[PDB]
Design an enzyme around this catalytic site. Structure first.
Site, short mmCIF file in Angstrom:
data_model
loop_
_atom_site.label_atom_id
_atom_site.label_comp_id
_atom_site.label_asym_id
_atom_site.label_seq_id
_atom_site.Cartn_x
_atom_site.Cartn_y
_atom_site.Cartn_z
N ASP A 139 -5.92 -18.37 2.85
CA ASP A 139 -5.87 -19.82 2.41
C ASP A 139 -5.72 -20.59 4.02
O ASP A 139 -5.82 -19.84 4.72
CB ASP A 139 -4.40 -20.09 1.70
CG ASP A 139 -3.09 -19.98 2.40
OD1 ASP A 139 -3.02 -19.78 3.63
OD2 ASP A 139 -2.10 -20.23 1.69
N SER A 152 4.91 7.40 2.67
CA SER A 152 3.85 8.38 2.45
C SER A 152 2.55 7.85 3.27
O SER A 152 1.75 8.70 4.02
CB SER A 152 3.62 8.88 1.29
OG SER A 152 2.86 8.01 0.51
N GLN A 180 1.91 -19.83 7.20
CA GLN A 180 2.85 -20.50 6.33
C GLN A 180 3.06 -19.99 4.97
O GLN A 180 1.97 -20.03 4.16
CB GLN A 180 2.83 -21.95 6.09
CG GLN A 180 3.36 -22.62 7.56
CD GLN A 180 2.24 -23.47 8.11
OE1 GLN A 180 1.37 -23.19 8.86
NE2 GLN A 180 2.88 -24.79 7.74
N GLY A 203 5.98 6.51 -4.46
CA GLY A 203 6.43 4.98 -4.45
C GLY A 203 6.67 4.83 -2.83
O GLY A 203 6.11 5.04 -2.02
N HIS A 218 -0.63 -13.25 -0.69
CA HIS A 218 -2.13 -13.80 -0.07
C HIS A 218 -1.95 -15.05 0.61
O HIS A 218 -2.88 -15.59 1.14
CB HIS A 218 -3.19 -13.51 -1.13
CG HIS A 218 -3.53 -12.18 -1.13
ND1 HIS A 218 -4.44 -11.81 -1.87
CD2 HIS A 218 -3.06 -11.06 -0.86
CE1 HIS A 218 -4.74 -10.35 -1.86
NE2 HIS A 218 -3.88 -9.85 -1.01
N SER A 219 -0.70 -15.84 0.64
CA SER A 219 -0.65 -16.97 1.15
C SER A 219 -0.55 -16.77 2.83
O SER A 219 -0.44 -17.55 3.47
CB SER A 219 0.66 -17.78 0.73
OG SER A 219 0.81 -19.03 1.20
N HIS A 243 0.91 -1.38 -0.08
CA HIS A 243 -0.13 0.07 0.01
C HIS A 243 0.92 1.23 -0.06
O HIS A 243 0.49 2.16 -0.21
CB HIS A 243 -0.89 -0.04 1.32
CG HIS A 243 -2.08 -1.21 0.91
ND1 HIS A 243 -3.38 -0.75 0.76
CD2 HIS A 243 -1.97 -2.46 0.47
CE1 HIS A 243 -4.18 -1.85 0.67
NE2 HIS A 243 -3.36 -2.97 0.29
N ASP A 244 1.89 1.15 0.46
CA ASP A 244 3.03 2.26 0.59
C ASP A 244 3.73 2.25 -0.96
O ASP A 244 3.57 3.26 -1.40
CB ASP A 244 4.19 2.07 1.41
CG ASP A 244 4.97 3.29 1.52
OD1 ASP A 244 4.48 4.49 1.20
OD2 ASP A 244 6.25 3.38 1.85
C1 HEM Z 1 -3.25 -6.98 -6.78
C2 HEM Z 1 -4.39 -7.10 -6.43
C3 HEM Z 1 -4.56 -7.00 -4.85
C4 HEM Z 1 -5.94 -6.71 -4.32
C5 HEM Z 1 -7.27 -6.62 -5.15
C6 HEM Z 1 -5.90 -7.10 -2.71
C7 HEM Z 1 -6.81 -7.15 -2.05
C8 HEM Z 1 -6.64 -7.41 -0.50
C9 HEM Z 1 -8.02 -7.35 0.55
C10 HEM Z 1 -8.93 -6.94 0.28
C11 HEM Z 1 -7.22 -7.35 1.76
C12 HEM Z 1 -8.13 -7.54 2.94
C13 HEM Z 1 -7.92 -6.16 3.84
C14 HEM Z 1 -8.73 -5.50 4.96
O1 HEM Z 1 -9.67 -6.46 5.02
O2 HEM Z 1 -8.47 -4.77 5.44
C15 HEM Z 1 -5.76 -7.82 1.39
C16 HEM Z 1 -4.95 -8.37 2.46
C17 HEM Z 1 -3.40 -8.48 2.45
N1 HEM Z 1 -2.79 -8.43 1.40
FE1 HEM Z 1 -3.82 -7.84 -0.68
N2 HEM Z 1 -4.37 -7.56 -2.51
C18 HEM Z 1 -3.63 -7.29 -3.86
C19 HEM Z 1 -2.35 -7.66 -3.82
C20 HEM Z 1 -1.56 -7.77 -2.70
C21 HEM Z 1 -0.30 -7.76 -2.95
C22 HEM Z 1 0.65 -7.78 -4.28
C23 HEM Z 1 0.47 -7.98 -1.65
C24 HEM Z 1 2.14 -7.61 -1.24
C25 HEM Z 1 3.00 -8.06 -1.63
C26 HEM Z 1 -0.74 -7.77 -0.81
C27 HEM Z 1 -0.68 -8.38 0.59
C28 HEM Z 1 -1.50 -8.52 1.60
C29 HEM Z 1 -1.47 -9.24 2.87
C30 HEM Z 1 -0.02 -9.45 3.43
C31 HEM Z 1 -2.69 -9.09 3.56
C32 HEM Z 1 -3.23 -9.39 5.03
C33 HEM Z 1 -3.31 -8.17 5.75
C34 HEM Z 1 -3.70 -8.62 7.39
O3 HEM Z 1 -3.70 -10.07 7.25
O4 HEM Z 1 -3.95 -7.80 8.04
N3 HEM Z 1 -1.94 -7.76 -1.15
N4 HEM Z 1 -5.45 -7.74 0.03
CA LIG Z 2 -0.34 -20.20 3.36
CA LIG Z 3 3.87 5.97 -0.57
#
Ligand code: HEM
Ligand SMILES: [Ca+2]
Ligand SMILES: [Ca+2]
Ligand code: HEM
Ligand SMILES: *[C@@H]1O[C@H](CO[C@H]2O[C@@H](C)[C@@H](O)[C@@H](O)[C@@H]2O)[C@@H](O[C@@H]2O[C@H](CO)[C@@H](O)[C@H](O)[C@H]2NC(C)=O)[C@H](O)[C@H]1NC(C)=O
Ligand SMILES: *[C@H]1O[C@H](CO)[C@@H](O[C@H]2O[C@H](CO)[C@@H](O)[C@H](O)[C@@H]2O)[C@H](O)[C@@H]1O
Ligand SMILES: *[C@@H]1O[C@H](CO)[C@@H](O)[C@H](O)[C@H]1NC(C)=O
Ligand SMILES: *[C@H]1O[C@H](CO)[C@@H](O)[C@H](O)[C@@H]1O
Ligand SMILES: *[C@H]1O[C@H](CO)[C@@H](O)[C@H](O)[C@@H]1O
Ligand SMILES: *[C@H]1O[C@H](CO)[C@@H](O)[C@H](O)[C@@H]1O
Ligand SMILES: *[C@H]1O[C@H](CO)[C@@H](O)[C@H](O)[C@@H]1O
Ligand SMILES: *[C@H]1O[C@H](CO)[C@@H](O)[C@H](O)[C@@H]1O
Ligand SMILES: [Ca+2]
Ligand SMILES: [Ca+2]
Lengths: 344, 344
Positions: free
Chosen positions: A195, A71, A200, A67, A177-178, A48-49
């Site tokens: 997942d 911010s 893990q 980037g 997302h794993s 997000h950053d």
């Molecule tokens: C590219 C399409 C993407 C979309 C539509 C998306 C969408 C989301 C959504 C909706 C959540 C839940 C957030 C919340 O409930 O507050 C999530 C969480 C998460 N995302 Fe993504 N995401 C994307 C890609 C990424 C990428 C590329 C990464 C980082 C390299 C990322 C890492 C994470 C992780 C680690 C969480 C879990 C946060 C926690 O467990 O509190 N996501 N994302």
């Molecule tokens: Ca996993």
């Molecule tokens: Ca930024």
């Protein structure tokens, strides 16, 4: 070289100050090196950053954002109001005290915490850390972070503008997302994993998004989500679409039973992402401060209990989904990962 | 029965007082329901408290101890000085305050904490809880808890005297080493697990103790230990001998790839151990207070990375060790589980 502290050594003097930040966050942010809520939040913060950069907006005379410049912390009162950034107001609030105590920039802290948070997850790759992210001058504009209700074409375009990430590289990024849960998508339940192994860094996310969906985990039909295959698991509409889209389906499938590919790809793409808005060759490599990742302590990819190869929606046209082992026991359910309580 | 909570419900009013105990230890003892150091410690407490009972000393006119009576806490000054109870003084110190705080008996608290602690571990059976263990009147004598340098014959005699556990039942009780580490056997390093999955109630302990041992994990030749097959894993000499003894080898191997047998057997024997010295019939069943166990989120038994069927030392003559799948990545290493810091 010997650090001034008399205690540590580093191949670059600028790296010295990160040893104390490591001990502090391992103990107090990640509660003894866990791959828990805070580690997952640290990784989401990097994304997000970092992706809030747009050469396309810049080229039109508009600020497209900096980037990886922290911010989202410096300007959190603007950036955490954006819909894609829901819930990060509390993540900023947890991370702020550590930045202040150590006198480091918000940008460098984000990249460091995200790398250390990932390394705590069994199966993680050796993570890198490049140093040198001055403070942000201005808040990134909205419309730069992808939403789970956006089409595949809209996401692919944003990614290509932001960082030149093609569709192959975009699939690699979603490996994140794993080790992740949704706290704010379903208003009735917080902490629904993507997942069945959110502690893990493995390929279960790539196996489980390929299953047919059978129910919503909570409130029915929330926009940006579709039916998931397991009670307690959330499936985002984008992840569902990527697994089935002809441009990405085979790449998505390639991680199934390939932990080595998973690690190699992510190690690379995470360095690319965390340095957007900067010249990597002008940064100092302090990768030597990031700890060796937790070792793999899991076997090959598997079908959750209660599912078979017949539950798979085959999408890769050139390669048929492999026949995996089914987990033992009763039909699988996924335990929730409760978010941290407000601050300290 | 409605609980005079104005909230909860139980089939027996005596069970309502355990809801508040649940909430408190889940948050403060087990640090948000984890299967970590404290959960493992609570399980070890059950064994060390309950097994100190001897019909054989009683018949000779000596006190043979009260079994599950909380004597390890009431008489901590005596019991925790015994060699088999090494490290339990810090554990008593951590548990005492909750006891005082909720005013439950120490014996009832120990059984409750161990059941809750195990249910936090993915793969655990649904755990029971029978209520009714009055405070101890006397400290158990020493010579009652088995040591890792004792012979199989000696351990078996001890278990048969204590609760009537045969060799089969003894193999079941040792399933508890699937969620455990040694903090005090190697003086050089604390937190060395007995299996590569200390946070999962699974059969890896049964797989791993069968592999040929190749190195000591810390100091060489420590008493009551043998060479283990993986860096970072301790192998106890009793565990080694049980995997290879003609009486026990096949029962030991029956758990490899049989999560269901693993769960059913342990559910039963844990209830048997926790009620030693009491009439289960005069006890109240408060099993409904115990949370449903964390679900299985792991596949079949596997060989750690770097090991194959060739590395197994076959002991069961009637059934050959199954050909399991080998885990991905480089040669497996086991991460330590650091003990909690000492409140004294
Ligand atoms: C590219 C399409 C993407 C979309 C539509 C998306 C969408 C989301 C959504 C909706 C959540 C839940 C957030 C919340 O409930 O507050 C999530 C969480 C998460 N995302 Fe993504 N995401 C994307 C890609 C990424 C990428 C590329 C990464 C980082 C390299 C990322 C890492 C994470 C992780 C680690 C969480 C879990 C946060 C926690 O467990 O509190 N996501 N994302
Ligand atoms: Ca996993
Ligand atoms: Ca930024
Ligand atoms: C009967 C033969 C057994 C022997 C010789 C034995 C031996 C040991 C030893 C030497 C340790 C390490 C302790 C230390 O370093 O402080 C240990 C830990 C453990 N034992 Fe056993 N044990 C036996 C049976 C069991 C059984 C029946 C249970 C419970 C049902 C059990 C539960 C545990 C647990 C959960 C721990 C880990 C403690 C924590 O990680 O701090 N043990 N055992
Ligand atoms: C998982 O466990 C049950 C338990 O049974 C036995 O497992 C053997 C390996 C053996 O060493 C023995 O110690 C143990 O009793 C397996 O078989 C079961 O047999 C019992 C006895 O009547 C029953 O409780 C089960 O319902 C029965 N199963 C069947 C299919 O009849 C079970 O087969 C085993 N699964 C695997 C993978 O073998
Ligand atoms: C399970 O199948 C294997 C075949 O992969 C048999 O194992 C053979 O190879 C082992 C090394 O992988 C070796 O230890 C074993 O003795 C066999 O020669 C095994 O017998 C099972 O049948
Ligand atoms: C795993 O990925 C590697 C690339 O890193 C590739 O060559 C191999 O074909 C893949 N193998 C499996 C098991 O699918
Ligand atoms: C078996 O049941 C579980 C628990 O309801 C589901 O999560 C799974 O999809 C299957 O229906
Ligand atoms: C499915 O059920 C499990 C236990 O079977 C829970 O942990 C989970 O929240 C989900 O509802
Ligand atoms: C490969 O290497 C590890 C050391 O990293 C051992 O644990 C294992 O036994 C195998 O030799
Ligand atoms: C070896 O163990 C098997 C389990 O795989 C039994 O079925 C068999 O009778 C023998 O004891
Ligand atoms: C093998 O390697 C792991 C990390 O890769 C350590 O944590 C372990 O103690 C062992 O030395
Ligand atoms: Ca006792
Ligand atoms: Ca285990």
């Amino acid at each position: 070289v010997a650090c001034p502290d008399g205690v540590h050594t580093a191949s670059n003097a600028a790296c010295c100050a990160w040893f104390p930040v490591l001990d502090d966050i391992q103990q107090n942010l990640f509660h003894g090196g866990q791959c828990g809520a805070e580690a997952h939040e640290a990784l989401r913060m990097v994304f997000h950053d970092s992706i809030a950069i747009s050469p396309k907006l810049q080229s039109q005379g508009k600020f497209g954002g900096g980037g990886a410049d922290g911010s989202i912390i410096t300007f959190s009162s603007i950036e955490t109001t954006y819909h894609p950034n829901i819930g990060l107001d509390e993540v900023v609030a947890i991370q702020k005290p550590f930045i202040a105590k150590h006198g480091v920039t918000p940008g460098d802290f984000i990249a460091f915490a995200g790398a250390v948070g990932v390394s705590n997850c069994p199966g993680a790759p050796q993570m890198q850390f490049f140093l040198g992210r001055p403070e942000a001058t201005q808040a990134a504009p909205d419309g730069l972070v992808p939403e789970p209700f956006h089409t595949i074409d809209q996401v692919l375009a944003r990614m290509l503008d932001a960082g030149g990430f093609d569709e192959i590289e975009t699939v690699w990024l979603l490996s994140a997302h794993s080790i992740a849960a949704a706290n704010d998508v379903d208003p009735t339940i917080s902490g629904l994993p993507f997942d069945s192994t959110p502690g893990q860094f493995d390929s279960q996310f790539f196996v489980e998004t390929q299953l047919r969906g059978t129910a919503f985990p909570g409130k029915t039909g929330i926009q940006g989500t579709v039916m998931s295959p397991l009670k307690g698991e959330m499936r985002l509409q984008t992840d569902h679409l990527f697994a089935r889209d002809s441009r990405t389906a085979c790449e998505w499938q390639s991680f199934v039973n390939n932990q080595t590919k998973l690690q190699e790809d992510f190690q690379f793409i995470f360095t690319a992402l965390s340095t957007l808005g900067h010249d990597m060759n002008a940064m100092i490599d302090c990768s030597e401060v990031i700890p060796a990742p937790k070792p793999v302590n899991f076997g090959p990819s598997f079908f959750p209990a209660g599912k078979t190869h017949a539950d798979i929606e085959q999408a890769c046209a050139s390669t048929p989904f492999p026949t995996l082992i089914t987990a033992p026991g009763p039909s699988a359910s996924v335990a929730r990962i409760p978010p941290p309580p407000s601050p300290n």
